[PDB]
Amino acid sequence: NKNSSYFVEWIPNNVKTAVCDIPPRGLKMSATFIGNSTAIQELFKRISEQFTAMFRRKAFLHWYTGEGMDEMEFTEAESNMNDLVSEYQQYQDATADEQGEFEEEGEEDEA
Amino acid sequence: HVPGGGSVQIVYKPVDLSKVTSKCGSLGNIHHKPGGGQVEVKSEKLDFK
Amino acid at A11: I
Considering only CA atoms, which of A79, A55, A2 is closest in space to residue B5?
Answer: A79
Pairwise CA distance, residues A26 & B27, whole Å? 68
CA B1 vs CA A32, A48, A55, B4: distances in Å: 44, 15, 11, 10
CA A109, CA A6: separation in Å to the nearest integer? 46
- Given CA atoms A31, A32, A37, A42 in this order, what sign does their dihedral have? positive
Name the residue of chain A whose CA is nearest to B8's CA.
A83
Please report the number of interchain residue pairs, chain A to chain B, with beta-carbon separation below 8 angstroms: 38
Q: What is the largest CA-CA distance in chain B?
A: 128
Contact residues, chain B, for A99 at CB < 8 Å: 12, 14-15
- Residues with Cβ < 8 Å from B10, sequence gap 6 or more? A90, A91, A94
Q: How many CA atoms lie within 13 A of A110 on its CB side?
A: 0
Please name every residue paired with A100 in a beta bridge, in sequence order, or none if there are none: B15
Q: How far is CA B41 from CA A31, B37, B44, B45, in A?
A: 88, 10, 9, 12
What CATH number is given to the structural domain containing A46? 1.10.287.600
Domain that holds residue A68: 40-94
What is the stated resolution of the deposited model, in angstroms?
4.1
Phi and psi at A100, nearest 5°, equal -90, 155
Cα distance from A31 to chain B (closest Cα, Å)?
A: 33
Question: What is the DSSP code string of chain A?
Answer: ---STTS-TTSS--------S-PPTT-S---------GGGHHHHHHHHHHHHHHHTTTTTHHHHHTTT--THHHHHHHHHHHHHHHHHHHHTT---S--BS----------
**Beta-carbon separation of B5 and A79 below 8 A:** yes
Experimental method reported for this structure: cryo-EM
